[PDB]
Amino acid sequence: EKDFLPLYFGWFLTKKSSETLRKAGQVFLEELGNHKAFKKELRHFISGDEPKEKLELVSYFGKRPPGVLHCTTKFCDYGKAAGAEEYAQQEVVKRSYGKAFKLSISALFVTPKTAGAQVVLTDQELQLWPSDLDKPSASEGLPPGSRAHVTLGCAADVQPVQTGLDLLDILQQVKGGSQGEAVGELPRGKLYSLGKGRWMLSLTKKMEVKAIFTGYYG
């Protein structure tokens, strides 16, 4: 018999770090939904603003991680995903399995589909980032590891994998220092309105979270 791989590999945040990031994300949703720039753009966010009332983003992102938060490196589907075996056989992956890492969170974001946190990997952590033969059209021209994120919430009919795609689309948009100017300032940083229902909070001070690199089997 052959050994199957994890569902996916990634960094799983400690209990304390997950709680700190989760709360920071929830506070962001509350502040954003209350901000006049967001309220004014609700039609670009939802088609159901027929009612001129307030959208509660915590409710909108009603599918959330139930427990510990994580940052996926390679989705393997037990070995069925393309590139899964190649990723898992790397020395660096086997050597790092079970080890602790610190991940830097540089931004929080919201789109009509997902709420998440942008992770900025170190050079060492980038060695654990996969390099496959399918660099999506979405990631082209962005540095390796740009997709690294923590999912904080998803709209009802959205899959968590969409969060990485949303982050890449946001990074394409702000690539050319194309942030322009902030539409406001929340307590933790500058708030950017990127159009098409996309919002990005750039943290004045990056958040550091501790996590264990390991395999999740579902």
Swiss-Prot record:
Keyword Chaperone appears in the UniProt entry: no
Principal localisation: membrane
Enzyme class: hydrolase
Catalytic activity: a nucleoside 2',3'-cyclic phosphate + H2O = a nucleoside 2'-phosphate + H(+)
Phosphoserine: residues bearing it: S47, S59, S178
Keyword list, A-Z: Hydrolase, Lipoprotein, Membrane, Methylation, Phosphoprotein, Prenylation, RNA-binding
Coiled-coil region list: none
GO molecular function: 2',3'-cyclic-nucleotide 3'-phosphodiesterase activity; RNA binding
GO biological process terms held by the UniProt record: adult locomotory behavior; axonogenesis; cyclic nucleotide catabolic process; oligodendrocyte differentiation; response to toxic substance
Annotated compartments: Membrane; Melanosome
Membrane topology type: Lipid-anchor
Catalytic residues (positions): H70, H149
The keyword Lipoprotein appears for this protein: yes
Binding annotation for substrate: T72, T151
EC number: 3.1.4.37
Physiological role: Catalyzes the formation of 2'-nucleotide products from 2',3'-cyclic substrates. May participate in RNA metabolism in the myelinating cell, CNP is the third most abundant protein in central nervous system myelin.
UniProt similarity note: Belongs to the 2H phosphoesterase superfamily. CNPase family.
Subunit structure and binding partners: Exists as monomers and homodimers.
Protein name: 2',3'-cyclic-nucleotide 3'-phosphodiesterase
Organism: Mus musculus
Full protein segment contained here: 181 to 398 of 420
